């Protein structure tokens, strides 16, 4: 069985989050948690919460076993951007994009 957890509209660029997501692809959930605990990145905190939520979903909604769980699929998708204005010199104006992303984690006992 496959269980899914998502975090949509996360305040982080997709490029930054993908750096942390690649560290736990295909790893056991027990080992994946250890890797995230000792990664000095803001995206690591966001990813860890999603991974924990997926584990809880499998245990509660599917009666799975924690020791048998494994991270099978993980990917990050680009989300909507927020437009802002940043004044520059000599009266010029610039556009600032605040990027977001969608984080998806899939855990299965296979």
């Amino acid at each position: 069985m496959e269980t899914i957890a998502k975090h949509r509209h996360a305040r982080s660029s997709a490029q930054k989050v993908r750096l942390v997501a690649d560290l736990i692809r295909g790893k056991k959930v027990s080992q994946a948690l250890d890797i995230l605990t000792y990664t000095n990145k803001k995206a690591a905190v966001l990813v860890k919460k999603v991974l924990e939520s997926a584990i809880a979903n499998a245990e509660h909604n599917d009666g799975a076993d924690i020791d048998d769980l494994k991270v099978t699929k993980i990917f990050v998708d680009e989300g909507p951007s927020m437009k802002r204005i940043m004044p520059r010199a000599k009266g010029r104006a610039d556009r600032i994009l605040k990027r977001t992303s969608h984080i998806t984690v899939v855990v299965s006992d296979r």
Binding site: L19, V20, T39
Partner: peptide, 18 residues
């Protein structure tokens, strides 16, 4: 630009945590 994960964690003799 890829990151490097920590190779391994140590275990305390008495407390026994990582």
């Amino acid at each position: 630009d890829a990151l490097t994960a920590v190779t391994s964690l140590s275990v305390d003799k008495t407390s026994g945590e990582k």
